[PDB]
Amino acid sequence: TADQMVSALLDAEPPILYSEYDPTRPFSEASMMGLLTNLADRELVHMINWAKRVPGFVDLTLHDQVHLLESAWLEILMIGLVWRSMEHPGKLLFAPNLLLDRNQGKSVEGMVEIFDMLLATSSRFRMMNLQGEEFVCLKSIILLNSGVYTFSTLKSLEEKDHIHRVLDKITDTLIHLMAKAGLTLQQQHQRLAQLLLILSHIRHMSNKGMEHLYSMKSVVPSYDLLLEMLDAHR
């Protein structure tokens, strides 16, 4: 049911991790990229656990699970960051001990442009009063949607049909949440659209972020890493 979908997603939420650095040492000696890389690397392991709990995800082939996570990982990191930063105007809560403003983004060439986008997205979330139940629906939508247009064998046709069925169930769930909040039918469809259009901007920001990461010529999980992490034993 829609209420069961909501509880499942909320129950699956990953933990909020801390940055790893000597708090009794001067900040200017740290590698900003080192801290951010190390944080994301640890978040990615919990990402895989969360993804396996998104209803419908483990019904797909391992190959298609990997394709979806390879497309979506940075969008999923970024929507979590924007959500964890919503109540910190002007700052990005990478971790509770790593709350950064835009001037701190200037320590890495090209990064302040990305921080500005993330900050503006968190502002948009605040303006709309995004609720946590909506947040978990949108994050699941990113996981299922971001790689689905870039997979026509029979099995692929079946995998795409299943993804679109799950996506439709999440839509039904978002509408149900909004009807419960007292929105009119018109406000429900307007708010659904506003939320989904924000996903376009998250995609944009992920593309700009990935371009920035690739420009360091080093900071990106490989196909084989994600495959090994998703291909678990019992």
Q: How far is the CB of 107 from a copy of itself (least distance, A)?
A: 22
Determine if 17 is a binding residue for a copy of itself (CB under 8 A).
Answer: no
Pick the piece of the chain touching a copy of itself (CB under 8 A) from 20-28, 36-44, 100-108, 145-153.
145-153
Query: After which residues does the chain have a break in its backbone, defined as C to next N over 2.5 Å?
Result: 151, 218
* Binding of a copy of itself by 201 (CB under 8 A): yes
First CA to last CA distance, the chain: 29
Closest distance of CB 157 from a copy of itself, Å: 10
| Alpha carbons 87 and 93: distance in angstroms, whole number | 9
Check: CB of residue 127 under 8 Å from CB of residue 51. no
CB of 95 to ligand 3YJ, least distance (A): 8
For residue 162, the partner it binds in a copy of itself, ligand 3YJ, none, with Cβ less than 5 to 8 A by kind, is none
Give the C-alpha separation, 206 to 204, whole Å. Answer: 5
CB of 149 to a copy of itself, least distance (A): 5
The half-sphere exposure of 100 on its side-chain side, counting CA atoms within 13 A, is 25
154 binds a copy of itself (CB under 8 A): no
Q: Which amino acids are annotated as binding site for 17beta-estradiol, given as ranges?
A: 43, 84, 212
Residues 39-98 binding ligand 3YJ (CB under 6 A) are 39-41, 43-44, 77-78, 80-81, 94
82: buried, middle or exposed (CB in 10 Å: 19+, 13-18, 0-12)? Answer: buried
Report how far residue 206's alpha carbon sits from residue 91's, in angstroms, rounded to the nearest whole number: 18
Residue whose entry in the numeric block shows the structure tokens 């930063």: 85
Contacts with ligand 3YJ by CB under 6 A lie at 36-37, 39-41, 43-44, 77-78, 80-81, 94, 111, 114, 209, 212-213, 219-222, 224-225
